[PDB]
């Protein structure tokens, strides 16, 4: 069966209580594709998480943008996976590039944070990707692998987790990343998920774009045969989100 | 005039919405000393920050346990001193000794922080304190004053500050630090701040006590000379936090 179509918004570190009201409320009057087609989640600061899953549409669904790597306790200043099961809230955004690189997350570590979560019973979108230094290296293939080895080490079901690859060589460096180049990522990625965990686990996983996502591109990454839909930035706290969600439609 | 005791309580990353509600009644029913004797402060995680907010008596404080360094944006999962101010949040405790050691927080990292977090005008529970093998190599003095000069290097107004002292030496190892000990770190640092900074800000800032306290010691604490209140741990979540406030009382 095809892989469905997934759209994550992540709003990183912005919100007001104001603002988080106008988005919640465009989100809630958005006409999309149905559940079948599409399947949106949409990622506020912990401080807002009980706003957004108390007045988001039931079936828009709400993602933390990190959790502790293990159970709570003596760990001031971190959010618990148990904490979030407890406010209903489902996903959990890990290992984003943001955190890797400026708050110095390792891989092992965010493999760690991922079977933590799942095993708490969240669902994972976890980012891999690398750097501009990386991709010039050569080393694309090489630094995507590690990380990704990292979480599949540590992950014995794959069914609630979604990779999610950003292009960081792309995201403020003057490089535009091409639908070309993002697919050629995501097939490498799929093909060593089928060497290294299994095929049905390859051909099932959803494998999203995390790199810039417009009304100029959305359509031609969301039908590149590897990408099944991406994971968003900036655009996430407006109502272009909107029309990047409707790019799931293939009439 | 007498520097007013202060009593915070850290929830550490504990809680559900079930339990945080059982702890706003116990202390929304609590019968302690005036405003005008004691000052507190309670830290619950961020998802719960607008939930103690909106129900806890008005004459208690909140806390959050942490904020970012900077400005918001492109910062995933971490929560802003602006977002803070947005929810009405008044506190924030920062350089708590489980972000410096679990999360590698720099001295310096955390006097970027204060400096922001005043500037955007929060009020700050500031923590310093020495591991086991820093005291037993002879340094207490050494660490707590770097620790604090990186602080002081960055802040010009210390009227929204509050020092709080951690014995980490004393946290899980097998010690029991007295209030001698207490009050010998507690003047020790009040002088570096009167010869670093000036006599007016060391006799008006308000130094905590953040090791173990209870009912066994808390009297005894609370009356040494340089030791202004406490930042209370585990404890905070329970009953038992009443009674420390109530230590505040020198009839
Ligand atoms: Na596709
Ligand atoms: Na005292």
């Given at each position: 069966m095809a892989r469905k179509f997934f759209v994550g918004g992540n709003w990183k570190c912005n919100g007001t209580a104001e603002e988080v009201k106008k988005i919640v409320n465009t989100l809630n009057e958005a006409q999309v594709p149905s559940q079948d087609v599409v399947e949106v989640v949409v990622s506020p600061p912990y401080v807002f998480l009980p706003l957004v899953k108390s007045t988001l549409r039931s079936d828009f669904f709400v993602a933390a943008q990190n959790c502790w790597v293990?159970?709570?306790?003596?760990?001031?200043?971190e959010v618990s996976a148990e904490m979030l099961v407890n406010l209903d809230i489902p996903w959990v955004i890990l290992g984003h590039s943001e955190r890797r690189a400026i708050?110095?997350?390792?891989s092992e570590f965010v493999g760690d944070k991922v079977a933590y979560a799942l095993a708490q019973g969240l669902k994972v979108i976890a980012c891999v990707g690398e750097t501009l230094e990386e991709r010039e290296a050569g080393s694309t293939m090489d630094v995507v692998a590690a990380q990704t080895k990292a979480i599949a080490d540590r992950?014995?079901?794959?069914?609630?987790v979604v990779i999610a690859y950003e292009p960081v060589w792309a995201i403020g460096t003057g490089k535009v990343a091409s639908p070309a180049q993002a697919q050629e990522v995501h097939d490498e990625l799929r093909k060593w998920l089928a060497k290294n965990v299994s095929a049905d686990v390859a051909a099932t996983t959803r494998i999203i774009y995390g790199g810039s996502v417009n009304g100029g591109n959305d359509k031609e990454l969301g039908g590149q045969a590897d990408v099944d839909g991406f994971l968003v930035?900036?655009?996430?706290?407006?109502?272009?989100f909107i029309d990047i969600i409707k790019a799931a439609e293939v009439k």
């Open positions: 293990k159970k709570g306790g003596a760990f001031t200043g708050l110095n997350e390792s992950v014995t079901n794959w069914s609630n930035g900036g655009a996430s706290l407006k109502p272009e």
